[PDB]
């Protein structure tokens, strides 16, 4: 194979990322509580429907609002 290189910069990105914080927030419902929960999340609440199946909206995260 062609394959080329030489150790000179390892660790870098993880190390120069600031390790920020995985921010906390509520413990979820689990098991039945969760599945019941999940359902509502995935479907239906406070709502109407035009026609489309889904999208998540973790787009947006470079949002507009």
């Amino acid at each position: 194979g062609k394959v080329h290189g030489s150790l000179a910069r390892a660790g870098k990105v993880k190390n120069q990322t600031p390790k920020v914080s995985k921010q906390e927030k509520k413990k979820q419902p689990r098991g039945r509580a969760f599945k019941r929960l999940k359902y509502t999340q995935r479907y239906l609440a406070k709502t109407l429907k035009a026609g489309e199946k889904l999208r998540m909206n973790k787009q947006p995260p470079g949002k507009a609002g």
Binding site: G31, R32, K35, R36, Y39, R42, K53
Partner: protein, 186 residues
């Protein structure tokens, strides 16, 4: 040397991210407010298996035994239980069937349907912190399926505070009266 017949039973369901597959399943799961896809798998299995049996059975050269035997058996319990029907008696629906038919006969759900409880969920939880008699035990296992006369039976654990001539330190949480008597106690 020597044995035991234990074994391992049930089968999971093939190949994931199929939007519809996920969707359909879920919706059903949504009706019942569930606790695992495993419960589905379970149903699929069973469903399947009888459905399998169905696949076999009909083709059997007519005038031959099994069809008679098993047909009657399947018919009578399922039908019996409040699953199959009298008109689902030419085994043609048996070929058919629906998963909901089954879910519907999860005894919990039948209950909620029966009225009792405010949902199938409300129904799970009730039964589960020990409530409403039919059998030897309330239904400790709401996991269960129906069987047509349990249908009637469905009522209190008279046993439970919920049908007691007295109550208990729980739910109602008499306890407080114990706390009263010990704490409040003059």
């Amino acid at each position: 040397r020597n044995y035991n017949n234990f074994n391992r039973v049930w089968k999971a369901p093939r190949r994931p991210f199929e939007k519809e597959r996920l969707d359909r399943e879920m919706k059903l799961c949504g009706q019942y407010g569930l606790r695992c896809k495993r419960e589905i798998w379970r149903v699929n299995m069973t469903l399947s298996k009888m459905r399998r049996t169905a696949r076999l059975l009909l083709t059997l050269p007519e005038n031959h035994p099994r069809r008679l035997l098993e047909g009657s058996a399947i018919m009578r319990r399922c039908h019996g239980y409040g699953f199959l029907d009298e008109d689902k008696d030419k085994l043609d629906y048996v070929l058919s069937l629906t998963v909901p038919d089954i879910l519907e006969r999860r005894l919990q759900t039948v209950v909620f349907k029966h009225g009792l409880a405010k949902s199938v969920h409300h129904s799970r939880v009730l039964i589960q912190q020990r409530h409403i008699a039919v059998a030897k035990q309330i239904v400790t296992i709401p996991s269960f399926i129906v069987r047509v006369s349990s249908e009637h039976h469905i009522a209190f654990a008279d046993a439970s505070p919920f049908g007691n001539g007295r109550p208990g330190r729980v739910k109602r949480v008499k306890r407080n009266a114990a706390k009263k008597g010990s704490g409040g106690g003059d």
